[PDB]
Ligand SMILES: C/C=C(/C)C(=O)O[C@H]1C(C)C2[C@H]([C@@H]1OC(=O)CCCCCCC)[C@@](C)(OC(C)=O)C[C@H](OC(=O)CCCc1ccc(O)c(CCCCCCNC(=O)OC(C)(C)C)c1)[C@@]1(O)[C@H]2OC(=O)[C@@]1(C)O
C-alpha cells in the first residue's frame with residue numbers, strides 16, 4: 001500500500017515487485033494477503049439479544065423497579081388465600097412496564113441503521129484481476145484483491161480497491177467520483193504521476209478510488225491500497241472513532257437517576273430513625289412478620305412513587321408529534337432525541353451552492369474591449385436578461401436592447417461559449433421547462449448563446465424542444481471540435497482545438513478556444529481582440545480589464561467571472577501530447593483575450609430573512625463555499641453574514657490561510673470567522689472540534705460520503721435530501737429542499753418543542769415528589785396505606801399522562817427567536833422553582849395522607865377513631881380490649897384510599913393548569929388558553945370515575961366509589977393548591993428578581 005499518486009508507474013511495479021504482464025504470482029498473493037489483510041471494511045460489531053436486553057435492564061431506575069417488582073412478587077406470594085386473589089397484579093404490572101420498556105429499546109435498535117454500514121453499499125462483490133496462475137483475466141471476489149496485483153476495470157464497474165492507473169486501454173477514461181469528492185460530472189484520468197505528495201483526492205488524476213464508478217472507458221492498474229487503508233476506509237475509521245455525547249436531557253435523566261437513588265435511600269434511613277422507639281418495645285414477635293411485611297410493601301410503594309413511569313412515554317410521543325410537524329416543513333428528523341439538541345444550536349455551518357443559493361446559474365454581464373489607442377481604452381459592457389436556463393431574454397448596452405450580431409467581438413465570444421462548453425440544454429415536454437444538461441456554469445454559457453444568436457439565424461417558428469440547442473449547434477457545425485484539454489486546478493481553465501471543416505474557411509484554419517479564471521488566463525495573454533483586429537496586450541488595457549473583473553466579483557453583484565480568450569496560432573497538432581494535464585497549461589499560452597462573462601448564482605428567497613432570524617436568535621452562521629474569499633466575502637455581505645461596510649479581517653479565512661496558522665490562532669479564528677472559502681475535506685472536521693472547544697452546539701451540512709466524518713462529529717449533522725445515502729444515515733436531520741432556511745425553521749420548532757416539553761416534565765416530576773411525601777408520612781406516622789402501588793402507576797401513566805402530553809401543545813412564546821440559545825447545562829428545576837415544588841409536594845403529601853385519615857376519624861361513613869391511635873392499628877385484634885371497641889378490619893377499607901387517590905387525582909389536574917406557565921398567573925394566562933389541556937382533564941376525570949364504578953376495576957385498585965359529600969371534601973382539599981401556587985408565583989413575579 002502506498003502514496004502511489006505521486007509515484008510513477010514503474011516505481012509502483014517496483015515497490016510491489018510485480019510484473020505488469022503476469023500480475024502477482026500465486027505465492028505473492030498468499031504473502032501479500034497475510035500482510036495486508038482482506039480488501040474489505042471491518043466486520044460489524046457483534047451485539048446479541050441477550051446483551052441488548054441486559055442493556056435495557058442497566059438503567060439505575062429500571063433496576064430499582066425490577067427489584068421492587070420482586071419484593072412485590074414475594075409479598076403477594078404471602079397474602080391470605082381468598083382474602084385476596086388480585087394479590088399478583090401489583091408485581092405483574094411492574095413487570096409489564098419493564099417488559100414493555102425492554103421490548104421498546106430492542107425494537108428501537110433493530111430498526112436502527114449504522115452510518116458505517118451504509119459504506120458497505122460501495123463495495124463491489126466481484127473484481128477483475130490478472131495473475132500469474134492464468135493467461136486470461138479472472139473475475140474474483142473483491143474481498144480477495146490484494147495491494148499490488150494487477151486489475152482491469154471498465155464501464156459500469158464499481159471500483160474495488162484504491163488503484164494507481166498503469167495504462168488506459170481506451171481512447172479516454174471517465175470516472176464518477178461524485179460521492180468521494182463532490183464533482184457531479186465524470187472526470188478524466190491520466191497515467192502520469194502527480195508531483196505533490198500531500199495532494200487532495202480531487203487532484204490525484206492518476207487515481208481510482210474504491211466505490212466510485214467508471215463512467216466511460218476501460219483501463220488497467222496496480223492496487224495502491226485495499227481495505228481500511230483506501231480513501232473510503234480512512235473515512236470509515238474517522239467515523240468509527242467518532243463518539244457522540246448524549247442529549248442534554250438524556251444526560252439530565254441519568255443525573256436524576258443517580259440522585260433519586262440517593263434520596264430514596266436517605267428516606268429509608270430517616271424512616272427507620274423515626275420509628276426508633278420500637279427498640280424500646282416488649283421483646284416478643286407480636287407481628288414480627290406483620291411489621292416487616294408492612295415496611296417492604298411501603299418500600300415498593302415508595303419506589304413507584306419516586307419514578308415517573310410515564311415521562312419517557314410522554315417525551316417520546318411529544319417528539320414524534322413535533323417531528324411530523326416538521327416533516328411538513330421539509331425538515332426530516334431522523335433521531336427524535338435530537339429535536340432538543342437542535343434547539344440549542346449556537347453555530348450553523350452551511351455549504352453555499354445547493355443550500356444557500358439556487359445553484360441555478362445565469363450570465364448577466366459581458367464585456368469585450370472596444371478600443372486601445374495607447375493609454376486610451378474603452379470597453380463594451382453588456383447585461384443579459386433572464387435567470388432561468390431558458391432561451392429567453394435580451395442583450396442590452398445601457399439598458400437599451402441590442403441585436404448581438406452587430407458587434408464582431410461578441411460573435412467570437414459567443415462561439416467560444418458554445419465550443420469550449422461540454423454541457424448543453426434539453427427541454428422536457430412533461431414539465432414544460434428548460435433543463436441543465438451538463439454543469440451549472442457551462443450549461444449557462446449554453447443559454448447565453450441561445451439568447452444572443454449572433455447571426456440572427458431565425459428560430460422563432462420552432463418548438464421549444466429543438467429551440468433548446470439551436471444557436472449552439474449552429475456554431476457547432478461551423479468549426480469541427482478536434483479535441484479538448486480538460487480542466488485542471490493548476491491552470492484553472494480548459495480549452496478546445498478546432499478545425500474549419502468545409503473549405504473557403506481553410507485560411508486561419510486551426511484555432512484554440514480558452515476559458516478559465518481571469519487572473520489565470522489573462523496573465524497568459526499577449527494580445528487582445530478589438531473587433532476582428534488584434535493588438536499587443538498592454539499594461540493600461542490589462543489594469544482596466546482586471547479592474548472591472550473586481551467590481552463584478554466584489555461589488556453588490558457578487559458575480560463569478562469567466563475569461564474567454566483564443567490562441568490564434570495554436571501549436572501544430574502533432575506537436576501536442578493530449579494526455580498530461582501538466583503540459584496543457586503550456587499549450588494555452590500566447591493568447592489574445594477576447595472578453596469576460598459574468599454569471600450569477602442567486603441566493604434563495606427565504607435565505608436573507610433566515611440569516612436575519614439567526615441574528616436575533618443569537619446563532620452564528622458560518623458559510624462554507626468554493627468561491628475565492630474575495631467574492632466569498634461579497635456573497636456573505638449580500639445575504640447578511642456581513643454588513644455592507646463591516647470589517648472582515650479576522651472573520652474570513654481560506655483553506656490555506658487557515659492551515660498556515662499555528663493550532664492556537666487556528667482555534668482563535670474559529671470563534672469569530674464566518675466565511676470559509678475553498679475549504680478542503682479535513683477542514684470541516686477541524687472547524688467542528690474547535691467550535692466544540694468553545695462549548696458550542698454546532699450544525700454541519702454535507703452531501704457526500706466525504707462529509708460523513710464531519711457530519712457525525714457535529715452536534716447536529718444536516719444532510720441534503722439530494723445527497724448520498726451514507727451522508728443521510730450519518731446526519732440527525734435531512735433537508736428535502738436542501739434549502740438552508742429549512743434549517744432555521746427546524747431550530748425554531750426545537751425551541752418551541754423544548755419549551756412545552758420543559759413544562760410537562762416539571763409537572764410530572766412535582767407529582768412524583770408529592771406522592772413520595774405521602775408515602776413518607778404514611779410510614780413516618782405508621783398509618784394505613786393511603787395510596788397503593790397499583791393506583792399510583794395508573795395516576796402516573798394515565799391520569800397524569802393525558803394532561804402531560806397536552807401540555808406539550810402549549811402556545812409557543814412570540815419571542816422564542818429573540819432570545820439567545822439555551823444553555824445545555826441549564827437544570828430543569830432549581831432555585832425558587834425547586835422550592836415551589838418542594839412546597840407543592842409538601843402539600844399534596846399532606847392532602848393525600850390527611851384525606852384518608854379524615855375518613856377514619858371525623859367522617860360520618862367512617863368510625864371516628866378520632867384523636868386516638870389510628871396509628872397503632874396493626875396491634876389491634878389483640879389489644880382490642882384496650883382502645884379498640886370496634887372491628888380491626890376498617891383499616892383495610894377502600895373508602896380511605898379512594899379518598900386520597902381522589903384528592904391526588906384532582907390536585908394533579910389543578911397542578912396541570914398551574915403548569916401552563918412557569919410564572920404567569922392563571923388570572924392572566926387562563927386555562928382555556930390550551931384547549932387540549934382542558935379536554936384531557938375531562939378524559940382523565942371520567943377515566944378516574946371508570947375505575948371507581950365499572951365493576952371489575954374497583955376491586956383490583958381497592959377503590960370504592962364515594963358519595964356526593966365525600967367528593968366535596970376532596971375539593972375542599974385539592975383546590976387550595978391553585979391558590980398556593982398563585983401566591984408562590986406572585987412572589988417570583990414581584991420580589992425575587994424577575
Ligand atoms: C423525585 C422524587 C423525590 C422524592 C426526590 O427527592 O426527587 C429529588 C431529585 C432526584 C431531584 C430533586 C428532588 O429533591 C427533593 O425532592 C427533596 C425533597 C425530599 C422530600 C422527602 C420527604 C418527603 C428535584 C426533583 O426536586 C424538586 C422540588 O423538583 C429537583 C430536580 O429535578 C429535576 O430537575 C427534574 C428535571 C430533569 C429531568 C429531565 C428528564 C427526565 O426524564 C427526568 C426524570 C425521569 C427519569 C426517568 C424516569 C421515568 N421512567 C424510567 O426511568 O423508566 C421507566 C420509563 C419507568 C421504565 C428528569 C433535581 O434536583 C432532582 O435531582 C436532580 O439531579 C435534579 C437537578 O434534576
Ligand SMILES: [K+]
Pocket residue numbers: 244711712713714715716717730
Ligand atoms: K453526530
Ligand SMILES: [Mg+2]
Pocket residue numbers: 181182351702703704707
Ligand atoms: Mg460537498
